[PDB]
Amino acid sequence: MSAKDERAREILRGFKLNWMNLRDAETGKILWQGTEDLSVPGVEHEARVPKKILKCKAVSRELNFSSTEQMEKFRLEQKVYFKGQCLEEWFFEFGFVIPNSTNTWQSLISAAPESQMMPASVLTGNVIIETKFFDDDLLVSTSRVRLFYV
Ligand SMILES: O=C1c2ccccc2N[C@@H](c2ccccc2F)N1CCN1CCC(N2C(=O)c3ccccc3N[C@H]2c2ccccc2F)CC1
């Protein structure tokens, strides 16, 4: 139990994801929206998204979160897993977070252009999104969401 460990736990303790949405980056239409805290580690969350998301060249994410703790460089690493294999990875950087703030973070998620999507029916229930929450190099948490394409 190091000092860094204790700090990671403190951040996790003060962190909350309050809401999120996903929109087609071309049309701006809403594909998903929710208030479930999908960041909570240690349980498999489940979400249903319309299969048309798989035709989007990019997805626009809007994510609202609160943190009692100050963070120097809040960032995420996210991986798409299909039957346990990684098909795609993203890095997003929020940066500095004021202690006891609530913040809305906008991100653009690009589909890898050199891949071809498997169909929805094959993907559905077989895809896990693993999100790791970091402050700089400190791992705060790792959560998973299984996706159904509906
Ligand atoms: O389903 C595929 C896919 C399937 C097979 C091969 C590649 C894929 N890549 C992407 C994708 C598909 C189309 C266009 C762009 C894309 F990025 N996707 C869409 C998944 N994508 C990346 C994960 C995104 N995500 C979040 O950003 C997120 C933020 C905080 C906490 C958990 C998160 N997990 C997911 C997420 C967000 C909202 C609802 C469910 C969900 F799982 C939601 C959008």
Side-chain angles (χ1 to χ4, degrees):
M1 200 60 192
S2 74
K4 283 187 194 206
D5 294 334
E6 171 61 30
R7 175 70 188 146
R9 287 184 181 189
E10 266 304 304
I11 296 176
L12 172 62
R13 185 177 166 79
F15 182 93
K16 171 86 180 150
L17 196 166
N18 305 124
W19 54 259
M20 181 161 42
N21 57 243
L22 298 184
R23 292 180 303 116
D24 186 313
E26 290 290 353
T27 141
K29 284 272 161 40
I30 291 169
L31 309 169
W32 189 84
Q33 65 177 356
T35 50
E36 204 197 316
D37 189 337
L38 293 188
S39 73
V40 177
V43 295
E44 188 182 281
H45 298 99
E46 245 84 352
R48 299 164 190 185
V49 300
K51 60 187 59 148
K52 47 173 191 293
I53 190 160
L54 300 161
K55 313 296 188 155
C56 292
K57 238 147 51 48
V59 168
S60 157
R61 180 179 62 206
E62 187 167 60
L63 189 167
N64 185 268
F65 69 93
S66 307
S67 181
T68 62
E69 308 309 295
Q70 177 160 303
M71 291 183 263
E72 311 295 305
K73 186 176 194 177
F74 173 44
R75 78 184 175 79
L76 309 171
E77 290 179 4
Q78 300 183 282
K79 286 175 171 174
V80 178
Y81 280 99
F82 168 83
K83 299 195 185 179
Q85 176 171 333
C86 183
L87 308 182
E88 191 167 15
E89 184 162 15
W90 301 264
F91 304 80
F92 298 103
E93 175 176 323
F94 178 84
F96 176 80
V97 176
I98 280 150
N100 299 116
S101 62
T102 288
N103 308 264
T104 285
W105 182 10
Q106 205 134 322
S107 290
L108 170 70
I109 311 171
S110 290
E114 16 61 291
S115 294
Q116 304 80 56
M117 284 293 183
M118 275 179 279
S121 65
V122 171
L123 294 171
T124 194
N126 287 126
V127 168
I128 292 285
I129 308 302
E130 183 197 66
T131 301
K132 284 170 172 179
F133 294 77
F134 282 96
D135 173 4
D136 211 334
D137 293 302
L138 194 61
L139 188 56
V140 170
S141 91
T142 305
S143 62
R144 299 177 214 289
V145 183
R146 185 178 300 280
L147 296 181
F148 305 98
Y149 296 96
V150 311

